[PDB]
Symmetry: C6
Subunit: 191 residues, 6 copies
């Protein structure tokens, strides 16, 4: 479950469900991405990686470990075309995981366009993506805050089933999706 | 920091762009993303050269581009964008990212940049300001030579805007950045 | 070096292919050839990444790829080929190439591989097993989730062939490697 | 940043162009932008090699291109440009940039450059010279072999112009650079 | 430094005699290939070089030869489009010849698709290829073992003039084509 | 030095070409410009390999490949040029810029070069010789197998030219360099 995230984004078989895989192996700092990915989705991976790279210290990733590793983002089924910016936060979560050996919580799906500032941006086809996550057995679905309005025409059943967390920042997403806390050392205070 | 509100052409017309820049440990790679057309990609290259040429004067380490990677990104990722009007915005975002000097988030800017750092006039001035106005921008930087073009835009819109016509990049920086580079 | 009988889509002729891998002194380059469409090219990258993530368990020096170049080739050279169905063959071949452990010549295999090492189901099982049968292959490895598809394969083909439905790459390698 | 007024082909037709060059710290990289077609791109390369081969004679550090990058840019970024007619401007701009010898602003120039530093004739001289004239250019450098082409250009335009027919890049540099190289 | 082998392979105007040239000069490990070559034929050159690299030790070649050499494979005539895999064993032979200083027999031609494991695969258009061999005065032609069936279709007089050697593997090709023992 | 007159196909017709070369302080980059078609670009790569394979004997430091950048440019820049006919000129220009050995004036040459250094026959010899004539060329080097094509060339053109049928690159360097 390390480096495996369920994203909701566009496929040629509809705004279906994505299984995103990442690997971090010995190398020289090369990035590879595969899975019949359109250009917009490829650019989203680049944006997600950069988000990771800038937040490195805070994520505990040494830049001088990152440079002796190669990264491969892969999205099966490999023959099915996928595109759009909606897996950006899925991409970023998967990248953080594979770089940190921090397993991704299961029954968790996410959709959202990522920015370099760590802001999660509204996406399209919320309904379809959630029909997708429903027929998938996913409980927790992370969606962008500005998509909250779009919920009103999602069947209560779907809503009652899905533990839905609207999210504004990448910071919340990682905490919701990762086993351990990705950011900052645990400091315990008592009153 | 590393964020600038620019005004440029998008598939649906002149609009607000949030230009993002990040600067991380690397070996001199620049990446630019956001469904950018080729003319816009080139303005990014010109803006970076402006920053590189004026590097030492701006506080920046003139050897920065051999040890760091730069990503310029313009959301939203799927919306096509093009033209050279983001140029001074590109430059300001780069300076900001490389110095850590916050950008005033009440300021939008539009204009083509040259390697000499002069601000060239742009097209579709009406759409850009109408966009800036609807988005609640308080202060807008426009090319000096677009001054004439203001009179074709609703007075009620111009009256709401603090408009600074500019000739040179050093003016843009001083007006948009928080501190004094 | 590495050779595995894969079953995968081709524009012409049989869907039965020999996946070949070579590992030679180099600087860490990857080369893949054989009139490969883009999906099949990506499946090579996936397969390699699988092996690289398990080099230790597989008994391969984790930093092997530093001083080594890899060439993956899929004859016949001029026959257009594509699709992900050669994934597990490519992975098996690469392991064979890097360990020196030979692959059984009476075994064919077909399946799409994931980075996690799972074996995904493929299309055209019938045409694939016919190529395998016509080609004299004794044992055929197929995705577990293609189990239901066997229902529509000729009983003689079913009678003549030893079919092992598989789920993960560990099974493939155990069955295929000598 | 070296600036030279070139006359060269654009999508609107032969026109006055500002050629910009920047030499900044780098590792020998060449960048060229400004919606340039391939033939113009190749002229930049020919131009640079001319300078590179004549480095010491021009008083340039012969290994300058080892620790430095070059960006040649021709605004306006959006207007397509092509053809070889900016070659001598490119070469002049690079020489100006690498030596700090500022270019005269009363001078425009047009002509194809070769590696041996010969200036070859170009087409559309009429359009080019009318463009220099409308833009208030006093002095225009043209290839020696374009001399006869002057006769089909209105006399009233040519009488206003100080025209210098040139054969070699050394002539170009002497006439166009402020200080004697 | 320049290996030379006669291959029989496909050109725009049909299967033909090709002179395959290979150069190994002071370099850093680059591979260059030219001669209006289509992609399949470009791929056969990469396959043929890989065969040599994998077998360098057995060929008496320093296994690190490529780290300090550049290779250029060129197939004249420059303007004639050529494609397909039939020049593969010729490419391998030229590369081995060049790298080991083992000259190539001049009356020999060869056609055959090479594989990384070094097996020679059958090609098409044997008759067209063999006649070009015959016209060009070639005495010896190496052909793939599985092309034996196609010999029945070749005019009897061409069969009688040509010394035809059906080969299964690259070692046979090299033994038959190189002046010295591989 | 580094300037050779070649005869090769252009979009305006088989024409006279001024091949230019410069060898500059650098790191081993090859640049070739002049709106050159791929076949003509490939002839440049072939010509360079010939020089590289013979560097020592040509009094060229064999490590020039690593310490110098070479730019091959064929004006006029906007005129498309293609085909293999400039090969021997390319080789000659290259030897010249690397050796400082000047190229004779009033020499033009046409011919496809091979890596072994053989000169191969070209097409359009007649349009090529007519071009050499009007450009005021005295001596013209042609491939040996193009001798037969001389029997289509006007009497005066032939009378005016000193034509040398050549088999090999070393006759070329001999007849063309000082």
């Amino acid at each position: 479950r390390v480096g495996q995230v369920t994203g909701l984004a566009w496929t040629e078989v509809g705004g279906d469900l994505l299984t995103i895989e990442t690997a971090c192996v010995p190398g020289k700092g090369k990035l590879t991405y595969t899975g019949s990915l359109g250009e917009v989705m490829q650019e989203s991976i680049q944006a997600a990686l950069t988000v990771v790279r800038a937040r490195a210290e805070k994520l505990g990733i040494n830049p001088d470990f990152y440079e002796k590793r190669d990264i491969h983002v892969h999205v099966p089924e490999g023959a099915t075309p996928k595109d759009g910016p909606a897996a950006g936060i899925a991409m970023c979560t998967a990248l953080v995981s594979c770089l940190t050996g921090n397993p991704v919580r299961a029954d968790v799906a996410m959709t959202g366009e990522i920015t370099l500032r760590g802001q999660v941006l509204p996406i399209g086809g919320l309904k379809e993506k959630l029909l997708a996550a429903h027929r998938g057995g996913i409980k927790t679905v992370l969606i962008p805050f500005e998509n909250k309005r779009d919920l009103e025409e999602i069947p209560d059943n779907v809503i009652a089933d899905l533990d839905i967390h609207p999210v504004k920042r990448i910071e919340e997403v990682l905490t919701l999706a990762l086993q351990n806390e990705p950011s900052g050392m645990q400091v315990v205070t008592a009153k």
